[PDB]
mmCIF file of C-alpha atoms and ligand atoms in Angstrom:
data_model
loop_
_atom_site.group_PDB
_atom_site.id
_atom_site.type_symbol
_atom_site.label_atom_id
_atom_site.label_comp_id
_atom_site.label_asym_id
_atom_site.label_seq_id
_atom_site.Cartn_x
_atom_site.Cartn_y
_atom_site.Cartn_z
ATOM 1 C CA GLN A 241 99.567 137.795 58.899
ATOM 2 C CA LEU A 242 97.495 135.149 61.207
ATOM 3 C CA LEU A 243 99.013 136.791 64.575
ATOM 4 C CA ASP A 244 97.479 140.017 63.334
ATOM 5 C CA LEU A 245 94.345 138.593 62.395
ATOM 6 C CA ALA A 246 93.993 136.901 65.445
ATOM 7 C CA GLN A 247 94.495 139.947 67.551
ATOM 8 C CA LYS A 248 92.028 141.702 64.748
ATOM 9 C CA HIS A 249 88.830 139.440 65.357
ATOM 10 C CA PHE A 250 89.151 137.329 68.566
ATOM 11 C CA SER A 251 90.699 140.374 70.340
ATOM 12 C CA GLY A 252 87.310 141.261 72.125
ATOM 13 C CA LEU A 253 87.229 138.435 74.968
ATOM 14 C CA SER A 254 89.773 140.546 77.326
ATOM 15 C CA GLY A 255 87.687 143.294 79.400
ATOM 16 C CA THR A 256 87.773 140.536 82.579
ATOM 17 C CA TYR A 257 88.064 136.788 82.205
ATOM 18 C CA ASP A 258 87.479 134.014 84.568
ATOM 19 C CA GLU A 259 86.225 135.743 87.512
ATOM 20 C CA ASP A 260 83.669 134.133 89.296
ATOM 21 C CA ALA A 261 84.042 130.365 88.311
ATOM 22 C CA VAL A 262 86.584 128.079 86.495
ATOM 23 C CA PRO A 263 86.149 124.303 85.826
ATOM 24 C CA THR A 264 89.092 121.668 85.535
ATOM 25 C CA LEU A 265 88.606 117.836 84.493
ATOM 26 C CA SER A 266 87.889 115.470 87.175
ATOM 27 C CA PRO A 267 89.800 111.672 86.896
ATOM 28 C CA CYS A 268 87.309 109.072 85.506
ATOM 29 C CA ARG A 269 87.106 105.559 86.959
ATOM 30 C CA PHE A 270 87.512 103.020 84.560
ATOM 31 C CA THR A 271 85.608 99.731 85.047
ATOM 32 C CA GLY A 272 85.989 96.202 83.974
ATOM 33 C CA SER A 273 82.593 95.344 83.163
ATOM 34 C CA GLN A 274 80.469 94.039 80.136
ATOM 35 C CA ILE A 275 77.225 95.492 78.403
ATOM 36 C CA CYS A 276 75.505 92.783 76.188
ATOM 37 C CA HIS A 277 72.688 93.921 74.003
ATOM 38 C CA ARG A 278 71.162 90.751 72.667
ATOM 39 C CA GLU A 279 69.595 90.781 69.209
ATOM 40 C CA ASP A 280 69.261 87.903 67.020
ATOM 41 C CA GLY A 281 67.866 89.853 64.028
ATOM 42 C CA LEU A 282 71.038 91.428 62.954
ATOM 43 C CA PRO A 283 72.965 89.418 60.983
ATOM 44 C CA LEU A 284 76.725 90.227 61.999
ATOM 45 C CA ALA A 285 77.813 90.349 65.767
ATOM 46 C CA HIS A 286 79.628 93.104 66.965
ATOM 47 C CA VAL A 287 81.981 93.188 70.041
ATOM 48 C CA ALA A 288 84.393 96.023 71.216
ATOM 49 C CA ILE A 289 86.871 95.157 74.215
ATOM 50 C CA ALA A 290 89.068 97.260 75.855
ATOM 51 C CA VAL A 291 91.353 97.463 78.890
ATOM 52 C CA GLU A 292 92.202 101.069 80.993
ATOM 53 C CA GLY A 293 94.730 103.394 78.676
ATOM 54 C CA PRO A 294 96.701 106.140 80.220
ATOM 55 C CA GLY A 295 95.751 108.924 78.670
ATOM 56 C CA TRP A 296 97.695 111.671 76.090
ATOM 57 C CA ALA A 297 100.165 112.687 78.133
ATOM 58 C CA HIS A 298 101.974 109.521 78.624
ATOM 59 C CA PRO A 299 105.195 108.434 76.685
ATOM 60 C CA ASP A 300 104.300 104.839 76.716
ATOM 61 C CA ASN A 301 101.524 105.269 74.269
ATOM 62 C CA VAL A 302 104.146 105.166 71.574
ATOM 63 C CA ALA A 303 104.829 101.469 72.698
ATOM 64 C CA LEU A 304 101.003 100.371 72.927
ATOM 65 C CA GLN A 305 100.916 102.165 69.317
ATOM 66 C CA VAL A 306 103.678 99.739 68.121
ATOM 67 C CA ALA A 307 102.058 96.775 69.682
ATOM 68 C CA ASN A 308 98.958 97.536 67.931
ATOM 69 C CA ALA A 309 100.232 97.590 64.617
ATOM 70 C CA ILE A 310 101.686 94.225 64.768
ATOM 71 C CA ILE A 311 98.394 93.388 65.552
ATOM 72 C CA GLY A 312 97.045 95.576 63.043
ATOM 73 C CA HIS A 313 93.459 95.492 61.455
ATOM 74 C CA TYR A 314 91.528 93.356 58.786
ATOM 75 C CA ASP A 315 88.749 93.533 56.662
ATOM 76 C CA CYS A 316 87.541 91.238 54.056
ATOM 77 C CA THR A 317 88.194 93.244 50.706
ATOM 78 C CA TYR A 318 92.021 92.914 51.982
ATOM 79 C CA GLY A 319 94.072 91.331 49.261
ATOM 80 C CA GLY A 320 96.459 89.527 51.680
ATOM 81 C CA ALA B 194 88.916 46.196 119.333
ATOM 82 C CA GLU B 195 89.701 49.833 117.944
ATOM 83 C CA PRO B 196 93.625 50.476 118.451
ATOM 84 C CA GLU B 197 93.520 53.212 115.907
ATOM 85 C CA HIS B 198 91.026 55.193 118.074
ATOM 86 C CA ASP B 199 93.981 58.101 118.944
ATOM 87 C CA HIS B 200 95.042 58.369 115.615
ATOM 88 C CA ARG B 201 91.382 58.607 113.906
ATOM 89 C CA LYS B 202 90.377 61.319 117.021
ATOM 90 C CA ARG B 203 94.143 63.200 116.028
ATOM 91 C CA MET B 204 93.158 63.107 112.513
ATOM 92 C CA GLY B 205 89.466 63.987 112.755
ATOM 93 C CA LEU B 206 90.929 67.412 114.759
ATOM 94 C CA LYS B 207 93.092 68.025 111.854
ATOM 95 C CA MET B 208 89.719 67.299 109.640
ATOM 96 C CA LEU B 209 88.005 70.239 111.434
ATOM 97 C CA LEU B 210 90.966 72.427 111.684
ATOM 98 C CA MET B 211 91.487 71.736 107.518
ATOM 99 C CA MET B 212 88.119 72.243 106.856
ATOM 100 C CA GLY B 213 87.146 75.358 109.045
ATOM 101 C CA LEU B 214 90.005 76.824 106.771
ATOM 102 C CA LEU B 215 88.823 75.771 103.536
ATOM 103 C CA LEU B 216 84.904 75.380 103.566
ATOM 104 C CA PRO B 217 85.012 79.415 103.909
ATOM 105 C CA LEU B 218 87.875 80.059 101.348
ATOM 106 C CA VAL B 219 86.512 77.751 98.550
ATOM 107 C CA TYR B 220 82.736 79.364 99.178
ATOM 108 C CA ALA B 221 84.542 82.574 98.995
ATOM 109 C CA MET B 222 86.381 81.583 95.625
ATOM 110 C CA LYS B 223 82.820 80.139 94.242
ATOM 111 C CA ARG B 224 81.185 83.602 95.404
ATOM 112 C CA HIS B 225 83.714 85.734 93.639
ATOM 113 C CA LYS B 226 83.503 83.731 90.677
ATOM 114 C CA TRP B 227 79.665 83.546 90.822
ATOM 115 C CA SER B 228 79.381 87.586 91.490
ATOM 116 C CA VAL B 229 79.478 88.495 87.578
ATOM 117 C CA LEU B 230 76.383 86.467 87.510
ATOM 118 C CA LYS B 231 74.763 87.180 91.295
ATOM 119 C CA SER B 232 75.126 91.198 90.199
ATOM 120 C CA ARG B 233 73.890 91.125 86.364
ATOM 121 C CA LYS B 234 71.318 93.507 85.533
ATOM 122 C CA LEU B 235 68.416 93.079 82.761
ATOM 123 C CA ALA B 236 66.878 95.360 80.760
ATOM 124 C CA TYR B 237 64.145 94.453 78.367
ATOM 125 C CA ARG B 238 64.169 96.921 75.214
ATOM 126 C CA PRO B 239 61.638 95.899 72.686
ATOM 127 C CA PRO B 240 61.331 98.307 69.617
ATOM 128 C CA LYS B 241 58.783 100.753 68.672
HETATM 129 C C1 PEE C 401 93.022 61.328 93.983
HETATM 130 C C2 PEE C 401 92.268 61.965 94.265
HETATM 131 C C3 PEE C 401 92.706 62.478 95.554
HETATM 132 C C4 PEE C 401 92.661 63.964 96.266
HETATM 133 C C5 PEE C 401 92.471 64.698 97.116
HETATM 134 C C6 PEE C 401 91.984 65.627 97.217
HETATM 135 C C7 PEE C 401 92.007 66.584 99.235
HETATM 136 C C8 PEE C 401 90.271 66.665 98.953
HETATM 137 C C9 PEE C 401 90.364 68.115 99.857
HETATM 138 C C10 PEE C 401 89.354 67.798 101.307
HETATM 139 C C11 PEE C 401 89.561 67.705 102.636
HETATM 140 C C12 PEE C 401 90.048 66.822 103.641
HETATM 141 C C13 PEE C 401 90.205 67.170 105.020
HETATM 142 C C14 PEE C 401 91.447 67.343 104.923
HETATM 143 C C15 PEE C 401 92.502 66.363 106.682
HETATM 144 C C16 PEE C 401 93.336 66.265 106.584
HETATM 145 O O1 PEE C 401 94.444 67.291 106.060
HETATM 146 O O2 PEE C 401 93.780 65.447 107.766
HETATM 147 C C17 PEE C 401 95.381 65.255 107.928
HETATM 148 C C18 PEE C 401 95.251 63.635 107.951
HETATM 149 C C19 PEE C 401 96.859 63.242 108.281
HETATM 150 O O3 PEE C 401 97.022 63.373 109.624
HETATM 151 P P1 PEE C 401 98.335 62.553 110.622
HETATM 152 O O4 PEE C 401 97.918 60.947 110.604
HETATM 153 O O5 PEE C 401 98.969 63.240 111.889
HETATM 154 O O6 PEE C 401 99.472 62.543 109.452
HETATM 155 C C20 PEE C 401 100.556 62.140 109.670
HETATM 156 C C21 PEE C 401 101.821 62.339 108.281
HETATM 157 N N1 PEE C 401 102.040 63.860 108.354
HETATM 158 O O7 PEE C 401 95.204 62.747 107.237
HETATM 159 C C22 PEE C 401 93.327 62.623 106.612
HETATM 160 O O8 PEE C 401 93.201 61.658 107.401
HETATM 161 C C23 PEE C 401 92.901 62.148 105.514
HETATM 162 C C24 PEE C 401 92.151 63.276 104.894
HETATM 163 C C25 PEE C 401 91.047 62.335 104.016
HETATM 164 C C26 PEE C 401 90.395 63.247 102.596
HETATM 165 C C27 PEE C 401 89.946 62.340 101.478
HETATM 166 C C28 PEE C 401 90.244 62.691 100.122
HETATM 167 C C29 PEE C 401 89.023 61.873 99.263
HETATM 168 C C30 PEE C 401 89.905 61.202 98.161
HETATM 169 C C31 PEE C 401 90.275 59.944 98.690
HETATM 170 C C32 PEE C 401 91.088 59.132 97.491
HETATM 171 C C33 PEE C 401 92.953 59.043 97.740
HETATM 172 C C34 PEE C 401 93.696 58.737 96.213
HETATM 173 C C35 PEE C 401 95.129 58.295 96.973
HETATM 174 C C36 PEE C 401 95.419 57.173 95.974
HETATM 175 C C37 PEE C 401 96.907 57.857 94.916
HETATM 176 C C38 PEE C 401 97.343 56.372 94.170
HETATM 177 C C39 PEE C 401 99.014 56.366 95.082
#
């Protein structure tokens, strides 16, 4: 029923396609750097620190996620 | 008067050769550590 609907309503993008220009993503350079926005009028500091990860496809996102799970997450309303 | 004459001069050459290797290398260690500060860019963004 979904494929039926997809042909019923989306078919209308045929005719001709991609005949003049096609865009594929270029890799993006990671830079080990720092940005410090110093504001002594806000009551709490926010800090986000990161290394370069591998990307969607990489099999070793699983092991990363596991390591992340171990460290986890905390918030003042946790009862533990 | 100065028996050690030869030895000091022998050591002095070694000192000069050591410093010639060491002085540029420690400077290079300093610069790379200091580079985080030497290329830092400031911007002031006051409100309103
Ligand atoms: C404790 C603190 C002592 C640590 C010292 C740290 C080193 C400082 C780095 C400065 C670079 C010095 C230039 C290098 C010159 C040196 O390499 O030349 C070699 C030459 C020997 O050559 P030869 O007679 O052919 O040797 C025969 C046996 N092989 O030795 C030089 O004369 C010595 C260099 C003197 C550097 C002065 C360092 C200043 C610190 C002095 C404090 C001494 C503390 C020792 C006491 C320890 C207690 C047991």
